[PDB]
PDB file of C-alpha atoms (C1' of nucleotides) in Angstrom:
ATOM      1  CA  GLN U 163      -0.633 -50.408 -55.394  1.00 57.19           C
ATOM      2  CA  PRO U 164       3.246 -50.376 -55.586  1.00 57.01           C
ATOM      3  CA  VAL U 165       4.192 -47.119 -57.000  1.00 58.85           C
ATOM      4  CA  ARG U 166       4.771 -47.306 -60.883  1.00 57.36           C
ATOM      5  CA  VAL U 167       5.579 -44.442 -62.955  1.00 57.72           C
ATOM      6  CA  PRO U 168       3.365 -44.172 -65.960  1.00 58.93           C
ATOM      7  CA  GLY U 169       4.806 -43.459 -69.417  1.00 58.71           C
ATOM      8  CA  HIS U 170       7.960 -42.522 -71.147  1.00 62.05           C
ATOM      9  CA  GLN U 171       7.833 -38.698 -71.598  1.00 61.13           C
ATOM     10  CA  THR U 172       9.344 -36.357 -68.880  1.00 60.33           C
ATOM     11  CA  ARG U 173       5.984 -34.318 -68.819  1.00 62.10           C
ATOM     12  CA  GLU U 174       3.855 -37.341 -67.439  1.00 61.61           C
ATOM     13  CA  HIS U 175       6.705 -38.083 -65.278  1.00 61.06           C
ATOM     14  CA  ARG U 176       6.323 -34.570 -63.863  1.00 59.20           C
ATOM     15  CA  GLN U 177       2.577 -34.672 -63.430  1.00 60.99           C
ATOM     16  CA  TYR U 178       2.513 -37.776 -61.489  1.00 61.29           C
ATOM     17  CA  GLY U 179       4.640 -36.328 -58.681  1.00 59.33           C
ATOM     18  CA  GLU U 180       2.508 -33.149 -58.316  1.00 56.85           C
ATOM     19  CA  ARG U 181      -0.677 -35.193 -57.675  1.00 58.69           C
ATOM     20  CA  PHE U 182       0.624 -37.915 -55.203  1.00 55.86           C
ATOM     21  CA  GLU U 183       1.832 -35.086 -52.794  1.00 56.14           C
ATOM     22  CA  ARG U 184      -1.541 -33.078 -53.488  1.00 58.13           C
ATOM     23  CA  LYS U 185      -3.500 -36.293 -52.576  1.00 55.08           C
ATOM     24  CA  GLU U 186      -1.554 -37.447 -49.567  1.00 55.57           C
ATOM     25  CA  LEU U 187      -1.056 -34.024 -47.951  1.00 52.05           C
ATOM     26  CA  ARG U 188      -4.023 -31.746 -48.824  1.00 52.79           C
ATOM     27  CA  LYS U 189      -6.237 -33.258 -46.160  1.00 53.05           C
ATOM     28  CA  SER U 190      -7.437 -30.199 -44.125  1.00 52.67           C
ATOM     29  CA  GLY U 191     -10.992 -29.823 -45.508  1.00 53.22           C
ATOM     30  CA  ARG U 192     -11.802 -26.369 -45.150  1.00 54.11           C
ATOM     31  CA  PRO U 193     -15.552 -25.357 -45.720  1.00 53.00           C
ATOM     32  CA  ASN U 194     -15.778 -23.463 -48.788  1.00 52.19           C
ATOM     33  CA  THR U 195     -12.636 -23.807 -51.058  1.00 54.89           C
ATOM     34  CA  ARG U 196     -11.214 -26.160 -53.546  1.00 55.23           C
ATOM     35  CA  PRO U 197      -9.923 -29.383 -52.010  1.00 55.01           C
ATOM     36  CA  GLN U 198      -6.469 -29.104 -53.732  1.00 57.33           C
ATOM     37  CA  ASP U 199      -5.776 -25.505 -52.624  1.00 57.11           C
ATOM     38  CA  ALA U 200      -2.676 -24.516 -50.776  1.00 55.07           C
ATOM     39  CA  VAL U 201      -4.562 -23.579 -47.661  1.00 55.31           C
ATOM     40  CA  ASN U 202      -5.579 -27.283 -47.190  1.00 53.90           C
ATOM     41  CA  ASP U 203      -1.935 -28.401 -47.156  1.00 54.27           C
ATOM     42  CA  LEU U 204      -1.287 -30.414 -43.746  1.00 55.77           C
ATOM     43  CA  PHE U 205       2.393 -29.020 -43.499  1.00 56.59           C
ATOM     44  CA  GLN U 206       1.092 -25.382 -42.603  1.00 57.48           C
ATOM     45  CA  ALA U 207       1.016 -26.664 -38.874  1.00 57.21           C
ATOM     46  CA  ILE U 208       4.720 -27.397 -38.814  1.00 56.95           C
ATOM     47  CA  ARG U 209       7.260 -24.309 -38.108  1.00 59.47           C
ATOM     48  CA  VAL U 210      10.980 -25.150 -38.717  1.00 57.87           C
ATOM     49  CA  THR U 211      13.057 -22.202 -37.694  1.00 58.60           C
ATOM     50  CA  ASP U 212      16.574 -21.438 -38.858  1.00 57.91           C
ATOM     51  CA  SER U 213      19.738 -22.692 -37.202  1.00 55.84           C
ATOM     52  CA  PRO U 214      22.037 -20.309 -35.106  1.00 57.28           C
ATOM     53  CA  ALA U 215      25.099 -19.054 -36.856  1.00 59.36           C
ATOM     54  CA  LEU U 216      28.094 -21.395 -36.589  1.00 61.85           C
TER      55      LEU U 216
ATOM     56  C1'   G L   1     -99.516  90.834 -76.007  1.00 61.15           C
ATOM     57  C1'   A L   2     -96.611  89.740 -80.459  1.00 62.84           C
ATOM     58  C1'   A L   3     -89.910  91.104 -80.633  1.00 65.28           C
ATOM     59  C1'   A L   4     -84.002  91.404 -78.368  1.00 66.26           C
ATOM     60  C1'   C L   5     -78.128  84.229 -74.891  1.00 68.61           C
ATOM     61  C1'   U L   6     -76.231  86.908 -66.114  1.00 70.06           C
ATOM     62  C1'   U L   7     -72.992  86.368 -71.623  1.00 70.25           C
ATOM     63  C1'   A L   8     -67.443  86.985 -73.146  1.00 69.81           C
ATOM     64  C1'   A L   9     -62.491  85.419 -71.492  1.00 69.11           C
ATOM     65  C1'   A L  10     -59.633  82.062 -67.035  1.00 68.86           C
ATOM     66  C1'   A L  11     -54.787  74.997 -66.504  1.00 67.86           C
ATOM     67  C1'   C L  12     -56.557  73.467 -59.119  1.00 67.27           C
ATOM     68  C1'   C L  13     -51.192  75.257 -60.788  1.00 66.43           C
ATOM     69  C1'   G L  14     -45.896  75.809 -58.238  1.00 69.48           C
ATOM     70  C1'   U L  15     -41.850  73.386 -54.526  1.00 70.80           C
ATOM     71  C1'   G L  16     -40.835  68.040 -52.303  1.00 70.99           C
ATOM     72  C1'   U L  17     -35.662  61.162 -52.310  1.00 67.73           C
ATOM     73  C1'   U L  18     -40.301  55.991 -48.900  1.00 67.36           C
ATOM     74  C1'   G L  19     -35.452  58.171 -46.577  1.00 68.10           C
ATOM     75  C1'   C L  20     -32.064  56.818 -41.657  1.00 67.35           C
ATOM     76  C1'   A L  21     -29.505  52.255 -37.912  1.00 68.26           C
ATOM     77  C1'   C L  22     -28.853  46.449 -38.705  1.00 64.65           C
ATOM     78  C1'   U L  23     -22.950  40.270 -40.089  1.00 61.57           C
ATOM     79  C1'   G L  24     -27.733  34.280 -42.521  1.00 59.10           C
ATOM     80  C1'   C L  25     -24.839  34.427 -37.247  1.00 58.81           C
ATOM     81  C1'   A L  26     -23.445  30.594 -32.785  1.00 57.78           C
ATOM     82  C1'   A L  27     -22.345  24.863 -31.402  1.00 58.56           C
ATOM     83  C1'   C L  28     -20.406  19.894 -34.646  1.00 58.57           C
ATOM     84  C1'   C L  29     -13.415  14.639 -35.609  1.00 56.45           C
ATOM     85  C1'   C L  30     -15.355  11.488 -42.566  1.00 57.23           C
ATOM     86  C1'   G L  31     -15.108   8.587 -37.367  1.00 56.93           C
ATOM     87  C1'   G L  32     -15.398   2.785 -35.712  1.00 56.94           C
ATOM     88  C1'   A L  33     -13.798  -3.192 -37.199  1.00 56.80           C
ATOM     89  C1'   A L  34      -9.684  -6.068 -40.947  1.00 54.90           C
ATOM     90  C1'   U L  35      -1.926  -9.889 -40.812  1.00 51.55           C
ATOM     91  C1'   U L  36      -0.094  -8.909 -48.081  1.00 52.26           C
ATOM     92  C1'   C L  37      -1.380 -13.991 -46.129  1.00 49.23           C
ATOM     93  C1'   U L  38      -1.467 -20.109 -47.707  1.00 48.34           C
ATOM     94  C1'   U L  39       1.929 -24.693 -50.505  1.00 43.55           C
ATOM     95  C1'   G L  40       7.711 -24.938 -52.329  1.00 44.73           C
ATOM     96  C1'   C L  41      15.453 -28.991 -49.773  1.00 45.85           C
ATOM     97  C1'   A L  42      20.036 -24.384 -54.940  1.00 45.77           C
ATOM     98  C1'   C L  43      19.076 -29.579 -56.684  1.00 43.25           C
ATOM     99  C1'   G L  44      19.741 -33.860 -60.124  1.00 41.66           C
ATOM    100  C1'   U L  45      23.081 -36.916 -63.827  1.00 40.40           C
ATOM    101  C1'   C L  46      29.365 -39.359 -64.274  1.00 36.48           C
ATOM    102  C1'   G L  47      33.452 -44.469 -70.248  1.00 39.55           C
TER     103        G L  47
END
RNA sequence: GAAACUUAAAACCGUGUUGCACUGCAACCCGGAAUUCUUGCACGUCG
């Protein structure tokens, strides 16, 4: 569906964003855990170091 | 022959360490395995 923000209050505007990421990025599938746990996040396999000092 | 106590009195007693020498001792790791880890833009809004 084309993304529509449901509602008027800012509390349901908050809870829509923290579930779209948790659906589209928690796709690791560890054997015995909750499927929306932080160890299932796909962005744990990318290591971005700092920049050198300018 | 019938009649008159080999009787009376007298501690099996006195003295004397079941005592002298002798280590419940010698040898022995509270030791071997284990990431304070996983997710997160110092950012948004301008008569």
